[PDB]
Amino acid sequence: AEILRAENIKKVIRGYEILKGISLSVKKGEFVSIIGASGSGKSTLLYILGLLDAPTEGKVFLEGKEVDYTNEKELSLLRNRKLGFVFQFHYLIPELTALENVIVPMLKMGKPKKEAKERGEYLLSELGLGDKLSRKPYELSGGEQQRVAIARALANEPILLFADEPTGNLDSANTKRVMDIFLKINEGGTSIVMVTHERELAELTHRTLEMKDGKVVGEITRV
């Protein structure tokens, strides 16, 4: 039940081939991790798979349909409708409450405000922030802000979450809390593709792609 495929993806950045021909697929419901040395192309690949950057060569298919990277507005539309993102950085809006931050993407897509606020409240309860709904981000710790960002990532019921180093800058306890959140999300059926520096975190996922110098050099599958 493919949800994502890449075919012969290459990416040139400043005259160098950062990605050198990658093909992969991801099934609906799968938790896939990507590991490899710094400069291997892991984040570059994730940004292409997540419709943030276009490939130089190759094709990407989302839910079995080829992605057209040539109209920015239409690409943003598809991305906002289908995908959610978590990064090391939380990109909260500091003048808005934790609740308001979560419903932003829903309002953007035209979801009615009542319905949107209820969803933002369900999501935030789900992620241990029911008590911080009205808090502004500069009041929240990094770990709490990550939980706001994950709630927001789930706002439009995405079919795929992309996570780029989601536990960076997080202590042990918050790293475990956030990884457990991802595990529970994936259990509910949402696919996740996660780039990580931590092999111990990759070990908790169903499949790991190992990268080196812009190629996939290894694949690890865990049952």
Question: Given the rule CB under 8 A, which residues bind its own copies?
Answer: 43, 47, 52, 76, 85, 87-95, 136-138, 142, 145, 164, 169
Q: CB atoms < 10 A from the CB of 128, how many?
A: 14
**Break positions in the chain: residue before each gap, C to N over 2.5 angstroms:** none
- What lies within 8 Å, CB to CB, of 13 at 6+ separation is 44
Q: Please, what's the largest Cα pairwise distance for the chain? A: 50
Q: How many CA atoms lie within 13 A of 153 on its CB side?
A: 27
Residue 196 touches which member of its own copies, Mg ion, none, C-beta under 5-8 Å by kind: Mg ion
208 belongs to the binding site for Mg ion (CB under 5 A): no
In whole angstroms, how close is the CB of 130 to its own copies at the nearest point? 16
Residue 145 touches which member of Mg ion, its own copies, none, C-beta under 5-8 Å by kind: its own copies
Residue 115 touches which member of Mg ion, its own copies, none, C-beta under 5-8 Å by kind: none
CA distance 212 to 41: 8
Residue 47 touches which member of Mg ion, its own copies, none, C-beta under 5-8 Å by kind: its own copies
- 40 belongs to an annotated ligand binding site: yes
Q: Which 3 state secondary structure label does DSSP give 211?
A: strand
- 39 belongs to an annotated ligand binding site: yes
196 belongs to the binding site for Mg ion (CB under 5 A): yes
Hey, what amino acid is at 48? I
Choose among 138, 72, 51: nearest CA to 101.
138
40 belongs to the binding site for Mg ion (CB under 5 A): no
- 41 belongs to an annotated ligand binding site: yes
CA distance 178 to 196: 13
Name the segment binding Mg ion (CB under 5 A); options: 9-17, 29-37, 51-59, 194-202. Answer: 194-202
- 37 belongs to an annotated ligand binding site: yes
State the DSSP H helix or E strand holding residue 216, giving kind and residue range, or none if neither: strand 215-221
Q: Which is closer to Mg ion, CB of 165 or CB of 210?
A: 165
- 125 belongs to an annotated ligand binding site: no
Residue 164 touches which member of its own copies, Mg ion, none, C-beta under 5-8 Å by kind: its own copies
Hey, what amino acid is at 44? T
Annotated binding site: 36-43
Q: Which residues bind Mg ion (CB under 5 A)?
A: 165, 167, 196
